[PDB]
Amino acid sequence: NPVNRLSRLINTQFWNSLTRRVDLNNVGEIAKDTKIDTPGAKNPRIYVPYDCPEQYEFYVQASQMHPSLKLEVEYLPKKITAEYVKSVNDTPGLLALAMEEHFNPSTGEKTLIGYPYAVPGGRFNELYGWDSYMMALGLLEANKTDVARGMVEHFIFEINHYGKILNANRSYYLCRSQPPFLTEMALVVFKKLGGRSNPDAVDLLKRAFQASIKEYKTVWTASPRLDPETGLSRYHPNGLGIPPETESDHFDTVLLPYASKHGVTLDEFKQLYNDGKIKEPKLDEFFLHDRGVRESGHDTTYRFEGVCAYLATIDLNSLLYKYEIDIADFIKEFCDDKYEDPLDHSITTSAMWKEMAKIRQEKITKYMWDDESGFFFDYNTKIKHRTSYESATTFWALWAGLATKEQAQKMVEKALPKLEMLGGLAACTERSRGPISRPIRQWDYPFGWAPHQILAWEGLRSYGYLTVTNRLAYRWLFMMTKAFVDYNGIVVEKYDVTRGTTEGFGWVNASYILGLKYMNSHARRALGACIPPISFFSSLRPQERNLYGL
Questions:
Q1: Which one in 116, 185, 463, 499 has a CA-CA gap of 20 to 30 Å to 404?
Q2: 13 is an annotated ligand-binding site residue
Q3: 177 lies in the same domain as 42
Q4: Residue 111 per-residue DSSP state
Q5: 34 Cβ partners below 8 Å, 6+ apart?
Q6: Which among 448, 412, 413 is positioned nearest to 429, based on CA atoms?
Q7: Considering 90, 280, 329, 493, which one is annotated as catalytic?
């Protein structure tokens, strides 16, 4: 039965196919990085934080053992600056990550072994960003909890030494973040570990929340990302010049015009830009939004083409609302309601945090909500004006819990129909994508994406619309199954939710196990048979058709 074979292969072989764990012999293998091709990129290189000597000694010991790799091991500046990153663009490295202490039990000798993590696909080696949240949900259902907690340990380390959660732990990503989830990623690994009853769990929860507050205070509610006027935040990272790791021809077409306005070749105009010698400020702005897109993780979409860095999206501000509520909880429960920040001696009560969330809610409802069409549009903060773009992310408001009971009912009724295609939620309505000529962007209609599905499921089920989750979860699980059958045992990164023709893919895999949570015996049987959603709902007694909002 196909849904049992795939499910079986996710829970066992694919997760192992995607685990990574850093010890003294694979370091070379992991740190090898093709994405950049200059001289300096020829030897695998790892960079260590300035204040981690025990870990420096580790990777140096490691580099001597398999010296044929010519692995280089460099300490990082204490003060990591956009100007510095721009320099190491030609000498790129894999950033050191978390590491757990393990001791000999009769001699007592300390050993380092890297906490384990998961890649998004057999064609990667880096710990990626928000991907790791979804994947951690799957790993927890497959009772591989060691790998889920592993990644929380890494995200604390990333925040504590590189100052943010990174797109992925490589040198050339040090200036970009990803959508923040660490609060609820901490919570679920906490609950699965034992909750208050596991002391190791309660230690991890506290660390992950001390670190979460640092991220909130110093990344998202902090300039340049924070818009002071509205109070909301934008994906607006630092960073200089052309992103190195791209396809070399990528920007060649947008660069060529300027290169000829300045009367040089493409290469010379590239070098002269990276060296700061070009005052072409709208080109400086283009690359602002590109780096801003790379931070939203919606890479790319016409929702963000050239506008991303000025947009306070429902995406990020829904996630921050979640941070504000999860943090109030942590303080009133584990800090006796008095959290003083060890960095700046800032005394906050959980009442205060809740108050932060209350105003976020009002602000988001103010600039973003549209009681006619049912959506939460993004708000532009330079043009000071709302968008017409209907995004699947409007449901993050429910995932986070900032929308009112009244608002959700309006969204289910008026907005969910503009987005619900054959196999689930398209990333955006057909209207808002526009026409194609203007190539198609992969986060746009007709594509639908695992993270959008997973968040809308939990978000609907939170506001009481589980009957609607069940219908949506069917259309997804079905379309994934018929592909694994037809495409002859293969799983795919993105899916067309409008029509349908060896390691899995992280959050796709995880999307499957988590949607099966939502299916009864009858439904699984109809899935095994590859019965399309219309046929199957049709085949049902109206009492049970009610279970799918029909």
A1: 185
A2: no
A3: yes
A4: E
A5: none
A6: 448
A7: 493
Provide the domain count of the chain: 3
Q: Has residue 27 been placed in a domain? A: yes
How many angstroms separate the CA atoms of 543 and 76, rounded? 63
Range of the domain at 476: 369-548
How far is it, in rounded angstroms, from Cα 260 to Cα 250?
A: 17
Cβ contacts of 145 within 8 Å, gap of 6 or more:
139, 189, 192, 193
Residue 164 sits in the same domain as residue 271: no
Look up residue 326 and give its amino acid: D
CA distance 73 to 44: 9
Q: Are residues 301 and 375 in the same domain?
A: no
Residue 124 makes CB contacts below 8 A (sequence gap 6+) with: none
Show the CA angle centred on residue 35, arms to residues 29 and 41, nearest 5°. Answer: 70
Q: Both 435 and 518 in a single domain?
A: yes
State the structure-solving technique. Answer: X-ray
Query: Is residue 475 part of an annotated ligand binding site?
Result: no
Tell me if residue 299 is catalytic. yes
Interhelix angle 199-215/145-157, rounded to 10 degrees, is 40
Please indicate if the annotation marks 90 as binding a ligand.
no
Any domain includes 346: no
Among the listed residues 72, 280, 299, 544, the single catalytic one is 299
In this structure, is residue 244 part of a structural domain? no
Domain final residue pick, 262, 288, 310: 310
Contacts of 294 (CB under 8 A, 6+ apart): 167, 176, 243
* 276 annotated to a ligand binding site: no
SS3 103: strand
Q: Is 215 a catalytic residue?
A: no
